[PDB]
Ligand binder design. Structure first.
Ligand SMILES: O=[N+]([O-])c1ccc(O)c(O)c1
Ligand SMILES: O=[N+]([O-])c1ccc(O)c(O)c1
Ligand SMILES: O=[N+]([O-])c1ccc(O)c(O)c1
Ligand SMILES: O=[N+]([O-])c1ccc(O)c(O)c1
Ligand SMILES: [Ca+2]
Ligand SMILES: [Fe+2]
Ligand SMILES: [Fe+2]
Ligand SMILES: [Fe+2]
Ligand SMILES: [Fe+2]
Lengths: 359, 359, 353, 355
């Protein structure tokens, strides 16, 4: 169990940006700029800085050229400069390695703290950032698939309850989770900004980064991303979806960047900002929990995720999950899922929904 | 081969309605009225007559209680009363069984001809019909999933070129089809009303009815039908979709009624009314042909379809397809499909796309 | 009355394109290409040829540089090559001036007949056209405001019944109209292709071209056009809408090009292909007939429209409507409209809504 | 000027509900339930408690039968039970009349403080509320016009800067405002929950309630409300819109209930939760500031607004605005607006846009 520090937690506003290491900067630029339409704040031979349509901070995504594709940092904005000091004290009390740079790790961010958190994830906390032109009414630029905000991160970690307690002490509130009747937690979603999540924990070998999520205004904007991928004959890069989630109630799509970093496109979840927001627990065997329409979850969604780096830039060692596997208990050989609790009709035994089995 | 009659073809306007035999009338009413929101023109203990939001003719769907669920008639409206006489002469010259009723087979239809056509299907031709209130501006009734028009039928038949040639002589024009490089045809779509199709042929054991399709205004209306089915905890009756089709370019969904009759919800195909409208042929191995986003086609879509009746109400004997099976050549153990023609990346061998094999 | 020819009418498929004369080609190009996103089929220093997303014929719009902005031709595609000969015989019998060019008037059209029709409008009939890449699945090109098809034309003419009967003889069927209890017709919509309209008649001084209409897939695509015009700070070129029409039930928007040619963006009207399609007549005083939500129709919509050219390229003289004016009877000083017939609550007198 | 208390401000989460006095409970029910589709949490012969599709607290709207239609309370939920104590101390230091009830003023709310605030408005602060079934995935109930959240209130008050300072001290942050080149402020928007507003101030004679706003998921849902109103032949109850706002960037519609209470339908504004969120100031003569498409703002939108009650249920006396009137300066006889700053073309003198 990760103890609660005596030192006060930093006041975290929201997820703010991710820095992803990519192997071919021009290929990655083609995906995030030419395909997905993100807006360039700055670029050079080594990095691309990108932001969503409604953002006013410098960026929501930094692509950094390097030898091994991986998550380098997931960054959260805090409420005041002083909260960066609070973060440093808090993580030092937790016995974590930290690095502080008064003028930032990446361009357009000022005083910043990066940490190897207790789950092995590279987190950044910052307040100071270069404001840029907020493009929210630049409909002369607006794409039919426009990504309007950064919404969340999702992390793969072997022990979800351990992680959940640590994030709750840091001030995230769990909005939804997936459990079974035998005490296992498979996933949890938790927020600061009053949406279903700012980060989330998915049970699996880790630390690895499951995805970064961007939102659109409307469901048709997500449809258009699919449509455009078809027209560009890159439909093999659509991993899963589009769908309606059970957890979050958002309309969703998962796609894969050139280094296989998974990106979610997301819209129309609900308000969670009240402190007694009802926490929703879904049973892992409920076949509407991930896709509300019952569509099967592709096995790569459960097995594949991005490497993460330590503060030296080396890949973090993976620790195997020993708790039960969501894949195995739902769509694997001894798996089970239901449409209606207690009804054999519309249940699935040892395979996925809708007539499919694991490849 | 089906010869072209000397007698002139009737001038067919459009698909108009289907008569489906259903086993439990109240359960079918719950599906078509309470779930899907179709509008009742007439009903009693034996039949329910249903129409779409923008229709002015008496009905688009007749549910007839009977012992064996099946298609009893697929009905086309012709341009004038005299075209019914033309249909009679045309099918008599073909040597088909016909039955003429001056006062109709179903309520709200007048003089009508039913035939057991050369492919074994019960076709109706009629002009006269009782007009009803056209509900197209009744936004006090409009549902979030509103079905606005009847769009088309789709028929399963073993020999597609044989059926296509016969429908062309009837005045239907091919818009799109699916072939392989060695001369096999798997499917064809053909129209009278200037959309992608009024009826279509799917290669398979037949005669069977693959589906009846209704339109919505917008893509979100289709999404709502899925969302409603999830809320009603009947997501197991969502067979396939939602998606974007390759062929037709329509946004789509397939669902199953209580007797397993398949209903397609469909929107935003293109205009085909010019006589040199460009035909489009897709290769059967192109994994964007059916779902443009590359999502796998569930095997039941290829295997399952409704019985059809002869004019005595008995089930038509099925004739087996001898040409290659689309299922087998694409997603079966020796199947294959591609994302980009000639590229092994994004190709699938012996399984479906996205990581699934056949269940 | 325009008598019906004994010569058979050409079989008209649909409205196909318009040729608009524009005064500043580059400014017009910025509007139709950079603002509206139409696709270039051909251009040079004198003309731009444009098409919609789902089109396979060469173009839906030809912009031709000239001294005086006007409609030069409104073109209808006919079913066969022989229908061009039929059109020529038909209009000759009508006593109209005609001009046949076996190699076309504009690029990408072959054998074509232009006429000064009995209402003073320059109509073209053609079959042959150069096919181009149908862009209907080119979602790499698709705009948030994408114009997907050419839908219809709308003509201003002084005597709507006279024009209506002429168009009915040509095979157009009336789908909707606006009348009053006195028996005056203010407007009528008529089709060949099985939508509410291919060419409509608006009562007013004419011949003038009221608008050309393009369709989108969805209502949000129309919203986006408005939003883009705001961002470009050209919201003054949004004339009327967005709204829901009563007549047609379509979602709509009217905007003005750099020469004040009016373009409608339009979506989601209904199927009219059956020959007994029920005709809908609205009362001119019904405040939901034009905008279903009861928003007022600004006077410029009734009074302003494009000049049209004769076959020499000179502007056609205008004939003043003598029938009652829809503007005057609804929003002028003695006009009125209602929300509910017979209810003074929600009625407007001498005054728009 | 309203002084800043020594006492700490309550931590306000969001706007939560309004109580509206209505004169005919059945006609109001028909508007809010049958036309607009709001969900009944509770009703009896005196009151209807309504909530939006995604709400879990007891209600977002209380309709209370009474002799004079008016706003009775605009309620904000606070973060903790202790914040209701803080609210009470804060308003007492401001010298405002307060009333606290441990068991609530309306059903489904527990310990609650109502105040007559420094601008004459009846504010409620509460934490405790009865949770109900959150209908957010009840797509079996979902309307083509579904109202999904309560978004904000908008208040008419004669002196905007005076009010703005008071709300900022309470912890609201200004997101957008409208000013001119002569030192006048015409409107301001301010939030707690990280949207463009939870309440807003519109310069005018007051206290009056300008509107209550509810959100939809998508723009077509707003369109459907207009289409349904046409089908019901009540299009005369559509006041303004639908449109795109300049301020807030939201898609919008304004309609009128049977007592003329104005309801906004609203979707797709932007995130404001960062404390240095950039504040946007529009010029009052910019004809894209209220409707981005330059559609004219009807004079009733400026002149008409609901009465508000004091804690005894009596109508608050209206104080006249002496600052310049947005109506007069933009669409009055001597008004002016522009499409492009400094461009005569697309400008309007002494009349509204679009003819
Ligand atoms: O329901 N799941 O599959 C979820 C729900 C929300 C998420 O953002 C996600 O990435 C997974
Ligand atoms: O691409 N296919 O799967 C199609 C395309 C159009 C249809 O109407 C259909 O039922 C199947
Ligand atoms: O109702 N009107 O104002 C209409 C309806 C359809 C149209 O295409 C139009 O241009 C005007
Ligand atoms: O721009 N205005 O007109 C606005 C902007 C936002 C609002 O919520 C409003 O009621 C008015
Ligand atoms: Ca268990
Ligand atoms: Fe996610
Ligand atoms: Fe189909
Ligand atoms: Fe029009
Ligand atoms: Fe508002």
């Amino acid at each position: 169990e990760i103890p609660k520090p005596v030192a006060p937690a930093p006041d975290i506003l929201r997820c703010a940006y991710a820095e992803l290491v990519v192997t071919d900067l021009a290929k990655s630029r083609n995906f995030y700029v030419d395909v997905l339409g993100l807006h360039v704040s700055y670029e050079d031979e080594n990095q691309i800085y990108l932001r969503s349509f409604e953002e006013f901070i410098h960026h929501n995504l930094v692509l950094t050229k390097g030898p091994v594709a991986a998550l380098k940092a997931m960054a959260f904005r805090v409420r005041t400069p002083e909260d960066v000091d609070k973060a440093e004290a808090y993580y030092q009390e937790l016995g974590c390695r930290t690095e502080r740079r008064k003028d930032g790790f990446v361009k357009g961010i000022g005083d910043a703290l990066r940490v190897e958190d207790p789950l092995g994830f590279p987190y950044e906390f910052f307040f100071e950032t270069t404001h840029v032109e907020r493009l929210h009414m630049r409909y002369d630029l607006y794409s039919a698939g426009e990504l309007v905000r950064l919404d969340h991160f999702n992390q793969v970690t072997p022990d979800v309850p351990r992680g959940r307690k640590y994030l709750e002490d840091l001030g995230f509130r769990v909005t939804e989770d997936i459990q079974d009747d035998e005490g296992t937690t498979y996933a949890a979603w938790m927020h600061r900004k009053g949406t279903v999540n700012d980060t989330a924990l998915t049970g699996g070998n880790g630390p690895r980064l499951h995805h970064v999520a961007f939102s659109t205004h409307e469901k048709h904007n997500i449809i258009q991303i699919c449509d455009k991928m078809g027209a560009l004959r890159i439909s093999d890069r659509i991993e899963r979806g589009p769908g309606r989630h059970g957890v979050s109630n958002a309309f969703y799509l998962y796609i894969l960047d050139p280094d296989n970093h998974r990106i979610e496109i997301y819209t129309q979840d609900y308000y969670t900002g009240d402190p007694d927001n009802p926490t929703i627990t879904w049973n892992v065997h409920d076949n509407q929990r991930r896709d509300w329409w019952g569509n099967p979850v592709v096995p790569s969604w459960y097995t594949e995720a991005s490497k993460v780096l330590d503060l030296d830039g080396n890949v973090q060692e993976i620790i195997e999950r020993t708790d039960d596997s969501e894949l195995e208990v739902t769509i694997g050989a001894d798996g089970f899922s239901f449409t209606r609790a207690g009804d054999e009709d519309g249940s699935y035994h040892g395979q996925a929904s809708k007539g499919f089995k694991l490849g």
